[PDB]
Amino acid sequence: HMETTEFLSNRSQAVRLPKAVALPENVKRVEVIAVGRTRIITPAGETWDEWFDGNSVSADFMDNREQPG
């Protein structure tokens, strides 16, 4: 809920996760997903967990493919 800064390390901008918002020690590797400006840091394997929670498509989202045939 606070803020941090990135830093060029090992030729990568990387990040410094605060101890206040640090990940579980049981998480060795973490998938990083790029969407627009935001970057999603999801545990390895645990990638799709963010997308399924929330981010609800609108109720009028056309389920019909309307494929000609």
């Binding site: 998938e31 997903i33 790029a34 969407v35 627009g36 999603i40 394997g45 645990e46 990638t47 799709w48 967990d49 963010e50 997308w51 399924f52 981010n55 609800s56 498509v57 609108s58 009028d60 989202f61 056309m62 389920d63 493919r65 494929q67 000609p68 045939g69």
Partner: protein, 132 residues
């Protein structure tokens, strides 16, 4: 690494319903999953067709960030050409977009993942899975 091609059907099925069965499945084969550009144009269409394009598209963007999008290549076009021609003789009818998705997979040798295997069963030489 990439082994699975998600058809258009399963994508909307996930995008709309977000089923729990698909949750862990997607998580398991993360990095080994791809979608055809044909599939992309359909999901984009549904979003832009809807009354809240920016929202649905955002959900779509998130989906597309995890999976690799495959551009329709000459191999896919040629393969689909054959696929289409075969189906003519067989009499079996397959959807226009679905035809392209099938050939696209066969060209790159991917496994098709679909909730409705019925349509794809007509086309031969394809591996079809049902993740619903």
């Amino acid at each position: 690494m990439l082994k699975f091609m998600l058809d258009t059907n399963i994508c909307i099925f996930t995008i709309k319903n977000k089923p729990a069965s698909v949750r862990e499945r997607f998580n398991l084969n993360q990095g080994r999953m791809c979608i055809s550009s044909v599939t992309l144009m359909e999901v984009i269409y549904g979003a832009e067709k809807s009354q809240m394009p920016e929202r649905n598209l955002a959900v779509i963007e998130g989906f597309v960030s995890r999976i690799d999008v495959l551009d329709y290549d000459a191999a896919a076009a040629t393969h689909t050409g054959q696929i289409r021609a075969e189906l003519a003789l067989q009499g079996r009818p397959v959807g226009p977009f679905d035809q392209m998705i099938a050939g696209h997979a066969r060209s790159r040798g991917l496994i098709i993942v679909t909730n409705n295997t019925r349509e794809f069963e007509r086309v031969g030489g394809l591996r079809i899975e049902d993740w619903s």
